[PDB]
């Protein structure tokens, strides 16, 4: 209802185009149905550009990492560590909304410094985990909220 990511389209990414289990769309649907309701990639870093169903004024940004979906629940070794959110401004320029460094938590729930109005948003995964033996990008949901 209030998460405004679901229905978003992928407009660009820096990952080889590839069918198709646990694709990018997995983190857009806002659900944790099962192990298959995430995005996972063997490429340990990269970015995703999405276009929301409409422009939104975003105040809050939530990421459900692997631990939130029941993977490595005890230690969080599979949880995304460094990752940033960018937005495309009115002039068409990408601007940094929020940088995260050193995360280990299952869920990151971040209020933005200020409300940001944009339709196109970018997630950049810098460091995909916290030293799990089975390294991968594993993101259950990318969620954002208006006031
Ligand atoms: Ca999901």
CSV table of C-alpha atoms and ligand atoms in Angstrom, one decimal:
chain,number,residue,atom,x,y,z
A,1,UNK,CA,0.0,0.0,0.0
A,2,UNK,CA,2.5,2.7,1.2
A,3,UNK,CA,5.7,1.2,-0.4
A,4,UNK,CA,5.8,3.0,-3.8
A,5,UNK,CA,8.5,0.8,-5.5
A,6,UNK,CA,6.2,-2.1,-6.6
A,7,UNK,CA,5.3,-1.8,-10.3
A,8,UNK,CA,8.6,0.0,-11.0
A,9,UNK,CA,10.4,-0.8,-14.3
A,10,UNK,CA,14.1,-1.5,-14.8
A,11,UNK,CA,15.4,1.1,-17.2
A,12,UNK,CA,19.2,0.3,-16.9
A,13,UNK,CA,21.7,-1.7,-14.9
A,14,UNK,CA,25.4,-2.7,-15.1
A,15,UNK,CA,24.7,-6.5,-15.0
A,16,UNK,CA,24.7,-8.7,-18.0
A,17,UNK,CA,21.2,-9.2,-19.3
A,18,UNK,CA,20.3,-12.7,-18.2
A,19,UNK,CA,17.3,-15.1,-17.7
A,20,UNK,CA,16.3,-15.4,-15.1
A,21,UNK,CA,15.8,-17.0,-11.7
A,22,UNK,CA,16.0,-14.4,-8.8
A,23,UNK,CA,16.2,-11.5,-11.3
A,24,UNK,CA,16.3,-7.8,-10.4
A,25,UNK,CA,12.5,-7.6,-10.3
A,26,UNK,CA,12.6,-9.8,-7.2
A,27,UNK,CA,13.6,-6.9,-5.0
A,28,UNK,CA,11.0,-4.5,-6.5
A,29,UNK,CA,7.8,-6.5,-5.6
A,30,UNK,CA,7.9,-5.6,-1.8
A,31,UNK,CA,7.3,-9.2,-0.7
A,32,UNK,CA,9.3,-12.0,0.9
A,33,UNK,CA,7.2,-15.0,-0.3
A,34,UNK,CA,10.1,-17.5,-0.2
A,35,UNK,CA,13.8,-17.9,-1.2
A,36,UNK,CA,13.0,-17.0,-4.8
A,37,UNK,CA,11.4,-13.6,-3.9
A,38,UNK,CA,14.7,-11.7,-4.0
A,39,UNK,CA,17.3,-10.4,-6.4
A,40,UNK,CA,20.5,-12.4,-6.4
A,41,UNK,CA,23.6,-12.1,-8.7
A,42,UNK,CA,27.0,-13.7,-8.9
A,43,UNK,CA,28.4,-10.3,-9.9
A,44,UNK,CA,29.3,-8.9,-6.5
A,45,UNK,CA,28.8,-5.3,-7.3
A,46,UNK,CA,26.9,-3.0,-9.7
A,47,UNK,CA,23.9,-0.6,-10.1
A,48,UNK,CA,20.2,-0.8,-11.0
A,49,UNK,CA,18.2,2.1,-12.4
A,50,UNK,CA,14.4,1.9,-11.9
A,51,UNK,CA,11.5,4.1,-13.0
A,52,UNK,CA,8.7,4.3,-10.5
A,53,UNK,CA,5.0,4.1,-11.8
A,54,UNK,CA,5.0,7.9,-11.1
A,55,UNK,CA,7.2,10.7,-9.6
A,56,UNK,CA,7.2,10.4,-5.8
A,57,UNK,CA,8.4,12.5,-2.9
A,58,UNK,CA,10.5,10.1,-0.9
A,59,UNK,CA,11.3,10.5,2.8
A,60,UNK,CA,12.2,6.9,3.8
A,61,UNK,CA,14.2,4.2,2.2
A,62,UNK,CA,14.1,0.5,3.4
A,63,UNK,CA,16.3,-2.4,2.3
A,64,UNK,CA,15.5,-6.0,3.2
A,65,UNK,CA,18.9,-7.8,3.0
A,66,UNK,CA,19.5,-11.6,2.9
A,67,UNK,CA,19.0,-12.0,6.7
A,68,UNK,CA,15.6,-10.4,6.5
A,69,UNK,CA,14.6,-13.2,4.1
A,70,UNK,CA,15.9,-15.9,6.4
A,71,UNK,CA,19.4,-16.4,5.0
A,72,UNK,CA,22.3,-16.4,7.5
A,73,UNK,CA,19.9,-15.1,10.1
A,74,UNK,CA,22.3,-15.6,13.1
A,75,UNK,CA,25.3,-13.8,11.7
A,76,UNK,CA,24.3,-11.5,8.9
A,77,UNK,CA,27.4,-12.4,6.9
A,78,UNK,CA,25.3,-12.3,3.7
A,79,UNK,CA,23.9,-8.8,4.4
A,80,UNK,CA,24.7,-6.0,2.0
A,81,UNK,CA,27.5,-3.9,3.4
A,82,UNK,CA,28.2,-0.8,1.2
A,83,UNK,CA,25.4,0.5,-1.0
A,84,UNK,CA,24.2,3.9,-2.1
A,85,UNK,CA,20.9,5.4,-3.4
A,86,UNK,CA,20.9,8.0,-6.2
A,87,UNK,CA,18.0,9.9,-7.8
A,88,UNK,CA,17.7,11.6,-11.2
A,89,UNK,CA,16.9,15.3,-10.8
A,90,UNK,CA,14.7,17.5,-13.1
A,91,UNK,CA,17.7,18.6,-15.3
A,92,UNK,CA,18.4,14.9,-15.9
A,93,UNK,CA,21.4,14.6,-13.6
A,94,UNK,CA,22.0,11.7,-11.1
A,95,UNK,CA,22.4,12.9,-7.5
A,96,UNK,CA,23.4,11.0,-4.4
A,97,UNK,CA,20.5,10.6,-2.0
A,98,UNK,CA,22.2,8.4,0.7
A,99,UNK,CA,25.4,6.4,1.1
A,100,UNK,CA,25.7,3.4,3.4
A,101,UNK,CA,29.0,2.0,4.6
A,102,UNK,CA,29.7,-0.9,6.9
A,103,UNK,CA,26.2,-2.2,7.3
A,104,UNK,CA,25.6,-5.7,8.8
A,105,UNK,CA,21.9,-5.4,9.8
A,106,UNK,CA,19.2,-7.5,8.3
A,107,UNK,CA,17.0,-4.5,7.4
A,108,UNK,CA,18.2,-0.9,7.0
A,109,UNK,CA,15.5,1.7,7.6
A,110,UNK,CA,16.7,5.1,6.7
A,111,UNK,CA,14.9,8.5,6.8
A,112,UNK,CA,16.4,10.7,4.1
A,113,UNK,CA,18.1,14.0,5.1
A,114,UNK,CA,15.4,15.8,3.2
A,115,UNK,CA,12.4,14.8,1.0
A,116,UNK,CA,13.4,14.1,-2.6
A,117,UNK,CA,11.1,14.2,-5.6
A,118,UNK,CA,12.1,11.8,-8.4
A,119,UNK,CA,10.7,9.2,-10.7
A,120,UNK,CA,14.0,7.5,-11.6
A,121,UNK,CA,16.1,6.1,-8.8
A,122,UNK,CA,19.4,4.2,-8.8
A,123,UNK,CA,20.8,1.6,-6.4
A,124,UNK,CA,24.5,1.0,-6.4
A,125,UNK,CA,25.8,-2.1,-4.6
A,126,UNK,CA,29.4,-1.5,-3.7
A,127,UNK,CA,30.1,-4.4,-1.3
A,128,UNK,CA,27.5,-7.2,-1.4
A,129,UNK,CA,28.1,-9.0,1.9
A,130,UNK,CA,30.0,-9.2,5.2
A,131,UNK,CA,32.4,-12.1,4.5
A,132,UNK,CA,30.0,-15.0,3.9
A,133,UNK,CA,31.7,-18.1,2.4
A,134,UNK,CA,29.1,-18.0,-0.4
A,135,UNK,CA,29.4,-14.5,-1.8
A,136,UNK,CA,26.6,-12.9,-3.8
A,137,UNK,CA,24.4,-9.9,-4.1
A,138,UNK,CA,21.2,-11.0,-2.2
A,139,UNK,CA,18.5,-8.3,-1.8
A,140,UNK,CA,15.0,-9.2,-0.8
A,141,UNK,CA,13.3,-5.8,-1.2
A,142,UNK,CA,14.0,-2.2,-2.2
A,143,UNK,CA,11.3,-0.1,-0.7
A,144,UNK,CA,10.7,3.6,-0.5
A,145,UNK,CA,7.9,5.7,1.2
A,146,UNK,CA,6.4,9.1,0.9
A,147,UNK,CA,5.5,11.1,4.1
B,1,LIG,CA1,11.1,-9.3,-2.8
